[PDB]
Amino acid sequence: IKHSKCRQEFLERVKANAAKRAEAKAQGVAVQLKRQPAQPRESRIVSTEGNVPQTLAPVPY
Amino acid sequence: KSSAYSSRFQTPFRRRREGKTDYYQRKRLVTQNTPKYRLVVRFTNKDIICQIISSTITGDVVLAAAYSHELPRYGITHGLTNWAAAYATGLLIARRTLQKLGLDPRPFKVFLDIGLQRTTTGARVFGALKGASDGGLYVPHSENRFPGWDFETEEIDPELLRSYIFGGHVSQYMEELADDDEERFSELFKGYLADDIDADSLEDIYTSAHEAIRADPAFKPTEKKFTKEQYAAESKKYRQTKLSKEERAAR
C-alpha cells in the first residue's frame, strides 16, 4: 500500500562502497570505508581586518 | 466567483481537464515485470491513427504505428476515413509489428483500446480490430459488434461482412447516385470521377491493396521537408516573447 525509500538508499551506499575498494586495490591505499559521526571542529586563525567587533550593550528596556 | 471559492477547489488532471483520456478505463488496461501491450486506435477527421503502446512510469513507449496517409503508397488514394480503409490499417499494423519481432512463439497478443468512442454495432472502430485479428495478432473479441450481426438471432452474415471489407456500402451507394440525381453525384465522389474509377473496380482496388500490405510493411519514412532547423526558424516568426519586469514597470 506503500513503498519505502531508506532501503533503496541503503543500496546506493553499497554501490559506492563497491567502487572504493576497487580503486584502493589498484593503487595501494587504505579504504576507510566506515562512516563517522560529526567531529569537534578544528582550530582556525580568524582576523577581522574587514570588520571591527561591536558592543551589544544589553539595554533594551 | 468568490475569492475563497477558487482557493478551495482542486483541479482535475490535465489529461482529464482536456477531455481526452478516461482515467477509469486506463487503470484497467495498464495494470495488467512484463510490458503490457495495447492497441490504441483513434479516428479524427481525415485520418486513421493505430499504435501499439506499452506502459512505463516515464509515461509510454510506442512499438509501431500505421497512419492513413501511408495508404496512397499502398494504392488507396480516396476515402481514407471509411470502414474499409480502417480494415486495411488494421491489417497494416499486424504485419508491421510482427516483422520486427520476426514471427512472420504462441501468438503475439494485443489488447484493444478505444478511447471515448461509443460502442455501437457496425462501428468503424472494430474494423481495425478485424484487420489485426486477420493479420496475425491475438486480439481477443466476439462477433457482436461486427456489421451483419442480427439483434434478433445469434448469427452473423459473412457475406455482408466480406462486402464491407471490400467497399460494399460505398460502391453500392455510387450506384444509387449514378442512376438518380447526378447533381449529388457530381459533388461527392469527385476524386473518383477525375481518376475515372467506376464502382465495380473499387472492389478490385481493395483486393490488390491487402496483397500490397502483406508485400512490404517495412515503413519507409517520408523523406522530409527542409530540415528541423529550417522548420524551427519559420516557427519562431509567429511565436511571441515574454516581457521583462523593467519593461512592465514603466508600462
Partner: protein, 164 residues
C-alpha cells in the same frame, strides 16, 4: 458567424392525466410530424391535483427547416408582435398562444381546445464544441450571442418590432 435557429420546442402543460393528456399528445404529433415525448412530475404539491411521476404533460422538439414553418405560422397568431422583454440574457425567446385552431385544424369535438407553449433557442455555428463528448469546451464571450443580438436579428427578418 451567422445566427441560425437551433431547435423549436413545443410544450403543453396539462394538470391532469387521462384522455386530456393523450388527446393533446395527438395534437403535437400531427402538427410536428413527430411522435412526442412525455414528462413525469417530480413531486407532489396537492394544490394542483398531482402526484409524483404521473406523466403530467407532453412536449415535442423540432429542428431544421421544418421548425421554421411552425414558427412563421405560429407567430402570425401573435400578429407579428412580441412583448418587450421575452428574451433571455443568453439570447432565446418563447411565446405562448391560446386557441390552437387559430393556426387552423379540423374542429375535433373529441379533442377540443388546447393552449400550446412555444420556445425558440438561438445559437451560432460552432456549437458542437459544447455538445460533443471528446474534448468538450466552452464557448467564448465574443461568440456567445447576447440579448442584444436577438433584438437585431428578430427585428430584421419576420418584419416585426419587438415592442415598448
Amino acid at each position: 458567424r451567422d445566427l441560425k435557429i437551433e431547435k423549436l420546442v413545443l410544450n403543453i402543460s396539462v394538470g391532469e392525466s387521462g384522455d386530456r393528456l393523450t388527446r393533446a399528445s395527438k395534437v403535437l404529433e400531427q402538427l410536428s410530424g413527430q411522435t412526442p415525448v412525455q414528462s413525469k412530475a417530480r413531486y407532489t404539491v396537492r394544490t394542483f391535483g398531482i402526484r409524483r411521476n404521473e406523466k403530467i404533460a407532453v412536449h415535442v422538439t423540432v429542428r431544421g427547416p421544418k421548425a421554421e414553418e411552425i414558427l412563421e405560422r405560429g407567430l402570425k397568431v401573435k400578429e407579428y408582435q412580441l412583448r418587450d422583454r421575452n428574451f433571455s440574457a443568453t439570447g432565446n425567446f418563447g411565446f405562448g398562444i391560446d386557441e390552437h385552431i387559430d393556426l387552423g385544424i379540423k374542429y375535433d369535438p373529441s379533442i377540443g381546445i388546447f393552449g400550446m407553449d412555444f420556445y425558440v433557442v438561438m445559437n451560432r455555428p460552432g456549437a458542437r464544441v459544447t455538445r460533443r463528448k471528446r474534448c468538450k469546451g466552452t464557448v467564448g464571450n465574443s461568440h456567445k450571442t447576447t440579448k442584444e443580438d436577438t433584438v437585431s436579428w428578430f427585428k430584421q427578418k419576420y418584419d416585426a418590432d419587438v415592442l415598448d
